[PDB]
RNA sequence: AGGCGGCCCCCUGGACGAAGACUGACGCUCAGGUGCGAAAGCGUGGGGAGCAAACAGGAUUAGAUACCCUGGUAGUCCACGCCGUAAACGAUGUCGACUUGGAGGUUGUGCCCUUGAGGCGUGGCUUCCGGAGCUAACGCGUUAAGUCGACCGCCUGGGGA
């Protein structure tokens, strides 16, 4: 998944200093940082399906927060989905 | 940083390399910003049954405070090293150095 | 023949029969006899005194080597493995200790289904 | 138990034929008995507790 | 497994030890679990059936 | 949840024990919709100990396409999908509130000179006995089959099916 040092990276940049981890940017960036990792792990194997059941929750929970982000602040919201680079 | 328990035996026929062998690991953890927490040579030790041959054997154990790769890179030297038949890592739960 | 004074009686005591084998230290079997190869057929093959008589027939033709000691091999439940050893007692043998020889599978082959009789 | 290197006390958990004695007779914590097997089957290749006396 | 011969000891005294030695598991009794083919559903309920029998 | 037990690393994930901040209703339910999904089998590339359908042989029987005995194909083990069904049961929808008891276990955790494996609280789960209550009874019975709040699901004689 992601390391504690690499988890510490996402909170600060997408949050208000290093202390805003409840910011959805932390999770989604953490989640965005994670879908690609398992994407790497899932890029190999292709046999880690049940962990891919861990894979979807990231993608779906990623959809949830961004769509959650849309209602609260689009000016902020538009920042991350481009910042997280999904949707066309 | 994770702490790990590293225990590996040098065959009694290989008893001399232990001084040469461990120092390389000493440079192996010292390199990765981690250090040693306990390094004891228990000496040669009897084993009840042969591992496809021979009884008794020489034991060496050392605890580490180093990253996974130096943990992982170190586990590489052991597989290739036929002198070091087995070392398997256990636990972190903070580092300790005690007992006998 | 050849004088050994230290043999080995491998007792295989089947549910139907109790077969014991005499052998030397390297395992090179010297002699061997069966409870069912000693009279008893069908039901009577797997009886203790049937295993006892097997020891009588197994206990002979193995001292012709002049065996003076022989380590023993336990094997499984059933009529033998107790009467065979008793008959071996009749000759005036010595035995220090008896150690279990059971291969304990650690979850190996799929088990057997009970005989739907 | 805790470690595979102390086969001396590990031996009380083995019958004379190398089959690991049930911890139920030996007692020991439920988790502790597991550590015995970890030190025994895999560490076999380290020759900790004998198979049996055949050879 | 070595079953050794001492000096002066009759084969009768160990006679008790002979069956006690392997009765602890039972060579043929555990052989009873490779003679035929059994579904694992049998043992699990074998554990289940035996588990129930084990409640005094 | 099915389902999960020889040993070690990555990662996960969920879960509960003590205080301190954080925001403030941001909650529960869900048609449709979305994922997973015990066992067998099959498709496809391997593997291949046990074996054991089908199927061969020997026995009983009046007869025994079986039970009894020797074989035995598939398959059972590593890789991709499908199939998505079963006594998948505690025959016990989901979430929140109230309520005699009794007696254990295990798992946090303070307390107490542990003055000793103990004594005294604070949570979780769970094991057995049972007040009330209620039930057609059977019994359940503070994890309610006793007392309330929301959503969803479902049945209308037997066979046909």
């Amino acid at each position: 998944s992601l390391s504690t040092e690499a988890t510490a990276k996402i909170v600060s940049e997408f949050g208000r200093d290093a202390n805003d981890t409840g910011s959805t940017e932390v999770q989604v960036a953490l989640l965005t940082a994670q879908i690609n990792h398992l994407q790497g792990h899932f890029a190999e194997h292709k046999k880690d399906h049940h962990s891919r059941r861990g894979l979807l929750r990231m993608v779906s929970q990623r959809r949830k927060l961004l769509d959650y982000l849309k209602r609260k602040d689009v000016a902020r919201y538009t920042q991350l989905i481009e910042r997280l680079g999904l949707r066309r | 940083m994770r702490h790990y328990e590293i225990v590996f035996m040098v065959h009694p026929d290989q008893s001399e390399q232990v001084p040469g062998m461990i120092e390389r690991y000493t440079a192996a953890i010292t390199g990765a910003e981690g250090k040693i927490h306990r390094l004891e040579d228990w000496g040669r030790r009897q084993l009840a049954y042969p591992i496809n041959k021979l009884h008794k054997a020489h034991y060496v154990l050392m605890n580490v405070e180093a990253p996974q790769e130096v943990i992982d890179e170190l586990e590489t030297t052991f597989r290739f090293n036929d002198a070091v038949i087995r070392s398997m890592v256990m636990r972190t739960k903070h580092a300790v150095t005690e007992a006998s | 023949r050849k004088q050994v004074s230290d043999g080995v009686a491998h007792i295989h005591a089947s549910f139907n029969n109790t077969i014991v084998t005499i052998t030397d230290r390297q395992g090179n079997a010297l002699g061997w006899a069966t409870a069912g190869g000693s009279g008893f057929r069908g039901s009577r093959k797997s009886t203790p005194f049937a295993a006892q008589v097997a020891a009588e027939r197994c206990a002979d033709a193995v001292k012709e080597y002049g065996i003076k000691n022989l380590e023993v091999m336990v094997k499984g439940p059933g009529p033998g493995r107790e009467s065979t050893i008793r008959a071996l007692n009749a000759a005036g043998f010595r035995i220090t200790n008896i150690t279990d020889v059971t291969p304990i599978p650690h979850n190996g082959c799929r088990p057997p289904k009970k005989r739907r009789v | 138990e805790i470690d595979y290197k102390d086969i001396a006390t590990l031996k009380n958990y083995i019958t004379e034929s190398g089959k690991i004695v049930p911890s139920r007779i030996t007692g020991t914590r439920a988790k502790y008995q597991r550590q015995l097997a970890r030190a025994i089957k895999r560490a076999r290749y380290l020759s900790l507790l004998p198979y049996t006396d055949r050879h | 497994p070595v079953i050794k011969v001492r000096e002066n000891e009759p084969f009768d005294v160990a006679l008790r030890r002979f069956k006690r030695s392997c009765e602890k598991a039972g060579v043929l009794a555990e052989v009873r679990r490779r003679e035929f083919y059994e579904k694992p559903t049998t043992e699990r309920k074998r554990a289940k059936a035996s588990a129930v029998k084990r409640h005094a």
Side-chain angles (χ1 to χ4, degrees), chain A residues 1-2 37-38 46-47 49-50 53 56-57 71:
Chain A
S1 178
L2 189 55
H37 166 76
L38 273 297
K46 186 151 43 181
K47 322 316 181 278
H49 309 296
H50 288 59
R53 197 172 189 271
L56 267 171
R57 165 153 147 285
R71 72 177 180 89

Side-chain angles (χ1 to χ4, degrees), chain C residues 12 15-16 18 20 27 31 45 55 62 65 74 82-83 88 91 97 102 106 109-110 113:
Chain C
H12 176 111
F15 293 109
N16 284 340
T18 69
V20 185
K45 173 176 68 171
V62 295
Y65 320 125
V74 181
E82 160 194 12
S83 71
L88 261 56
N97 191 359
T102 62
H106 308 339
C109 282
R110 207 173 185 262
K113 190 164 187 286

